[PDB]
A and B are shown apart, each in its own frame.
Chain A
Amino acid sequence: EEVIDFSKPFMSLGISIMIKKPQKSKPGVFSFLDPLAYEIWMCIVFAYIGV
């Protein structure tokens, strides 16, 4: 701008983040526990013990 003259921006932008699209993750061993949180499983174990 010190040596030329600009116009008002015709397109405003900024820095941003590019990532690879999340894919269907390869199922993990012990993915059969995913429907319930770990805390539920531990409470189940200790309720079994207590009962």
Chain B
Amino acid sequence: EKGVQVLLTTIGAFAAFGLMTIAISTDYWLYTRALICNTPGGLTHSGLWRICCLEGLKRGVCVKINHFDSAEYLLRVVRASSIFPILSAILLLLGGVCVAASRVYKSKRNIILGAGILFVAAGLSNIIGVIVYISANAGEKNHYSYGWSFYFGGLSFILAEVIGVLAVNIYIERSREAHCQSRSD
């Protein structure tokens, strides 16, 4: 029913926000080999901001990533700011807030719509951030791999799209109920 769908939507919003914040803050996106590891290089696990060496003399020390051709410059800027994943998390938060409001202003039906739009846009922004990250990593030192933070981001995207679908369905049902009641009245 409507109540269970709203409950799932709010749970998904909270879960996606948490997963994306975890992925952004976490530094386990990429497992690779880097020259700056104190001995082609040493194993490293990285993220969006900082990189940590593992299995090396400098084991456990984490250092801020040293980023840095107009398009390459723009890509480096966007990758450094990580504005797209952050925007995804922000939009998920705002959508959850709008859903909670929809749990109060049951009359205003154009709220659970904004929630869905924001969730879908957050999914798109996460896609863009993933593309930017993958593109920027490449350059022109092998057998690299992706960590659980990357898949947390992917899970956040999937959940955001699902809850956007559910919110749009809720809006559909609510508007249909109101319109049928009015016309029949």
List the interface of chain A (C-beta within 8 A of B). Answer: 23-24, 26, 28-29
Contact = CB atoms under 8 A, between A and B. Distances in A.
Nearest to A30: B71
B140 A23 contact: yes
Q: Say what secondary structure dominates the interface of chain A.
A: loop
Interface of B: 71-72, 139-140
A28 B140 CA distance: 13
A26 B135 CA distance: 11
Nearest to B135: A29
Nearest to B71: A29
A29 B74 CA distance: 12
A23 B140 CA distance: 9
A29 B72 CA distance: 10
7 contacts: A23-B140, A24-B140, A26-B72, A26-B139, A26-B140, A28-B71, A29-B71
Contacts of A28: 71
B74 to A, nearest CB: 10
A26 B72 CA distance: 10
A24 B71 CA distance: 17
A33 B122 CA distance: 29
Nearest to A28: B71
Nearest to A23: B140
A-B CB proximity, top 4 nearest: A29-B71, A26-B140, A24-B140, A28-B71
Contacts of B72: 26
A9 B8 CA distance: 90
Nearest to B72: A26
